Nucleic acid binder design. Structure first.
Lengths: 67, 65, 65, 67
DNA sequence: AATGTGGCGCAATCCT
DNA sequence: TAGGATTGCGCCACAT
DNA sequence: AATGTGGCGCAATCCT
DNA sequence: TAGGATTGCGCCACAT
């Protein structure tokens, strides 16, 4: 009975749940997009550190090798 | 008019476009979640590399003593 | 000359370039291995979708009987 | 003793192992690149199938909905 | 011990 | 020439 | 049972 | 105008 009073209230409750479920999903996605930006900045920091330490190690190894 | 052949083809075409658009969006969101897993593992790896390089520097500098 | 400052800077610069080139190559190879995992999971998903769509078609066509 | 006879033969054995290890790694990589091409063709086939079935289902659902 | 791997350095070359 | 990107050869530390 | 999710359809709009 | 891409609203089947 798609005209029933009970029907329309059942539909309304589900419509409310649907908007709630999707807001949550869209928020989660937004939080994830932010996490990527955060992890990217951290990745770049680590890359710079690895490069700096690698060059430091290389120079030191060369010194010893020159004895 | 809903019986109009033009209406019918319009709905048919739009339903295809709507599904295509929604799949693309789902794909992007999944990729973003994927990048988080990727970056997380990679940063973990680089951090390990940092620690390894530091140990190698310490080892060499111990030769001075 | 190996004592030449020019030689020393040449080695220093090349060692950086060599490491950079080797890391890039390692990255590409890891990505390729990654795509295999990705595609494998995705094809599995699409196959599941194919099966689901077929069940839905069967269900609707059963209404005719 | 990096001039020893034993040393040079030890180095030769490792050099042989290194080339063997790397050929294997490079082959594995080559096989993986091929697998990606194979999985990509399969992915495209599946995408086409999903699209075709989806349109088939949509048309059929519309028919019923028009009763 | 002996072979298998992974990271580098060198130097010739290729590339811009 | 300058200078970065590749790559064959091979040393070494470490893993299996 | 009641809410939470995922997939669609419609139709207004935006975009090319 | 034609026609594909988005997106707010909401129906429904199914999951939890």
């Amino acid at each position: 009975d798609k005209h029933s009073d009970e029907y329309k209230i059942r539909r309304e409750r589900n419509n409310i749940a649907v908007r709630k479920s999707r807001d949550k999903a869209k928020m989660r996605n937004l939080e994830t997009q932010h996490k990527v930006l955060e992890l990217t900045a951290e990745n770049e920091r680590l890359q710079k550190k690895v490069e700096q330490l690698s060059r430091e190690l290389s120079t030191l190894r060369n010194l010893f090798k020159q004895l």
